[PDB]
Antibody
Framework: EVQLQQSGPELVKPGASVKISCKAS????????MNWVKQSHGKSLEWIGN????????SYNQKFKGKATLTVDKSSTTAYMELRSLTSEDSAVYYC????????????WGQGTTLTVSSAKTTPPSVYPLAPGCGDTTGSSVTLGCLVKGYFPESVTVTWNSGSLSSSVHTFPALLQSGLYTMSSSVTVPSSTWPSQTVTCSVAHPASSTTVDKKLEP | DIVMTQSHKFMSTSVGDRVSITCKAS??????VAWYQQKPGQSPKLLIY???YRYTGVPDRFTGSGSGTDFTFTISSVQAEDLAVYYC?????????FGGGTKLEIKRADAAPTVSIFPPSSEQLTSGGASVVCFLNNFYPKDINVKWKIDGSERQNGVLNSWTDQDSKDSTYSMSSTLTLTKDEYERHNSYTCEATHKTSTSPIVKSFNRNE
C-alpha cells in the first residue's frame, strides 16, 4: 500500500534549521507531487508548497518562500522540507502529502512530524503507575493508569500491553506546567483480568529515546 | 489567495443524524474542492474530491456537493467515529488553501463519570513528589466539576485537569484531575478525596482513600 513515512519529531533551537523527510513507498514516486502542509496546534492546514519529484520543480506558498525549501531524492523516493530561521511560530505538525497531477487532491498523507522550536532541554518523563489503593472496592472493571510527568518536548506515546489494550484506553492531553508537560493515560480492563494478568504501560518519549514500562501492581 | 471559509468551527449532531458542513470559496473554484476528515491525533484523510466524488474506500454516507463558491460536505448518518475536524480545500489555484475546519461534536445522552482515585505511587513519593490523580471517565456532557478535599478541606492549588476529546466510540468525555503535592505535604494529611459533580446527579461522585489504609 501507499505509505508516506515522515521523519520523527524535531526539537530545534530558535534560529536553527531543520530538514524533515518523507519516505514514499508503495507507488511510482515520480507520478505524484509531494506537498508539505503545516498544522499549528489547534489550527487549520496550511499548504507550504509542492515539489514535482520528476524534475525537482517546486511551487511555494509565497508565505513560506525562503522559509521552506522543498527537495526530493528520486532514488530514495524521499521528499524533504527544510525549514530555516526557526522560531516558536514554526512549532507545528508538518505533513507531507501526495497529490496526483490529476485529479486534484491530497490523497495520502504522512503521519506528520512534530516540530518544537525551543531552547528548552529534552527532559524525559517520570512515569508513575496509577493502581487502586488497597482500600478500593473491586467492580466488574478496573481502571489503571500511568502518570507521565515532567517531560519535554511534547511527543510521548503510552502503550498498554503492546497495544493489545487500546479500545479501553484514555489518553489525557498533556498539560504544560513550568515548561514541562504532564499527561496521563488510563486503561480499563475487566477486574477478572487484572491483577491476575499483567497490565503494563510502556511510555515512549522519542526526544529522549526513553521507554519506561510500569507493570501495574496492586 | 483563494480563501475557503468554513464559518462554523463547530457543528453538533447526533449519531444517525445527517450533518452538513459548509465551505465558501472567496472566488469561483468550479468543483476543484476536496474535503478532508482529521480525527484527533491523526493525519487528514481525503473523503471527497472534485466537490462531489468520494475517494476510494470512503463510505457512502459521505457526500459533497456544490460548484463555484458554495460547497457542502454531508454525512448522511453520523457515526461516533466521525468525530473529527472536516476541512474543505480548493485545488483550483496556487497556493492550495484549506478551510479553517469544522469540528463535529456529537450530542449523545448524558452519562455519569466513572471516577477512580489513585494515591501517589511509591516511586513518585521516593522522588519527594505526590500526585493524586482522579480519572473521571466516559461522561457526557463535557462540563464537570472536580473538587479535591484533603482531610475534608477543599484543596484548589496544584490541581490540573485534562479533558479528552470526545470518544470516537461512545462520544463521551473523560478527564484526569491531578493534585500535585510535595511528598512532605501529602504525608501531612490522611484522607484524599476527589468529588465529581456532573449534571447526571445532584449527588457528587466521591472517591477517596486514606493514606493510612
Amino acid at each position: 500500500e501507499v505509505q508516506l513515512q515522515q521523519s520523527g519529531p524535531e526539537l530545534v533551537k530558535p534560529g536553527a534549521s531543520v530538514k524533515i523527510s518523507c519516505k514514499a513507498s508503495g507507488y511510482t514516486f515520480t507520478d505524484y507531487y509531494m506537498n508539505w502542509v503545516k498544522q499549528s496546534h489547534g489550527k487549520s492546514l496550511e499548504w507550504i508548497g509542492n515539489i514535482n519529484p520528476n524534475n525537482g520543480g517546486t511551487s511555494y506558498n509565497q508565505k513560506f518562500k525562503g522559509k521552506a525549501t522543498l527537495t526530493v531524492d528520486k532514488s530514495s523516493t524521499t521528499a524533504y522540507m527544510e525549514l530555516r530561521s526557526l522560531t516558536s511560530e514554526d512549532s507545528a505538525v508538518y505533513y507531507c502529502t501526495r497529490s496526483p497531477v490529476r485529479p486534484y487532491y491530497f490523497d495520502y498523507w504522512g503521519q506528520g512530524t512534530t516540530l518544537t522550536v525551543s531552547s528548552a532541554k529534552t527532559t524525559p518523563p517520570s512515569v508513575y503507575p496509577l493502581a487502586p489503593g488497597c482500600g478500593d472496592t473491586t467492580g466488574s472493571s478496573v481502571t489503571l493508569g500511568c502518570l507521565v510527568k515532567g517531560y519535554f518536548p511534547e511527543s510521548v506515546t503510552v502503550t498498554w500491553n503492546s497495544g493489545s489494550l487500546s479500545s479501553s484506553v484514555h489518553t489525557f492531553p498533556a498539560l504544560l506546567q513550568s515548561g514541562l508537560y504532564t499527561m496521563s493515560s488510563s486503561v480499563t480492563v475487566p477486574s477478572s483480568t487484572w491483577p491476575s494478568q499483567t497490565v503494563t504501560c510502556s511510555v515512549a518519549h522519542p526526544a529522549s529515546s526513553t521507554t519506561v514500562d510500569k507493570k501495574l501492581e496492586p | 489567495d483563494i480563501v475557503m471559509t468554513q464559518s462554523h468551527k463547530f457543528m453538533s449532531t447526533s449519531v444517525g443524524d445527517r450533518v452538513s458542513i459548509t465551505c465558501k470559496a472567496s472566488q469561483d473554484v468550479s468543483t476543484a474542492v476536496a474535503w478532508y476528515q482529521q480525527k484527533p491525533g491523526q493525519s487528514p484523510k481525503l473523503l471527497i474530491y472534485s466537490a462531489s466524488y468520494r475517494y476510494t474506500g470512503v463510505p457512502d454516507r459521505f457526500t459533497g456537493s456544490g460548484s463555484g463558491t458554495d460547497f457542502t460536505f454531508t454525512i448522511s448518518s453520523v457515526q461516533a467515529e466521525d468525530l473529527a475536524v472536516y476541512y474543505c480545500q480548493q485545488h483550483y489555484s496556487i497556493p492550495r488553501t484549506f478551510g479553517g475546519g469544522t469540528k463535529l461534536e456529537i450530542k449523545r445522552a448524558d452519562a455519569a463519570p466513572t471516577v477512580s482515585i489513585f494515591p501517589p505511587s511509591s516511586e513518585q513519593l521516593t522522588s519527594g513528589g505526590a500526585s493524586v490523580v482522579c480519572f473521571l471517565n466516559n461522561f457526557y456532557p463535557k462540563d464537570i466539576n472536580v473538587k479535591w478535599k484533603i482531610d475534608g478541606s477543599e484543596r484548589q492549588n496544584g490541581v490540573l485537569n485534562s479533558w479528552t476529546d470526545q470518544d470516537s466510540k461512545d462520544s463521551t468525555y473523560s478527564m484526569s484531575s491531578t493534585l500535585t503535592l510535595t511528598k512532605d505535604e501529602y504525608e501531612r494529611h490522611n484522607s484524599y478525596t476527589c468529588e465529581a459533580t456532573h449534571k447526571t446527579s445532584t449527588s457528587p461522585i466521591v472517591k477517596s482513600f486514606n493514606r493510612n489504609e
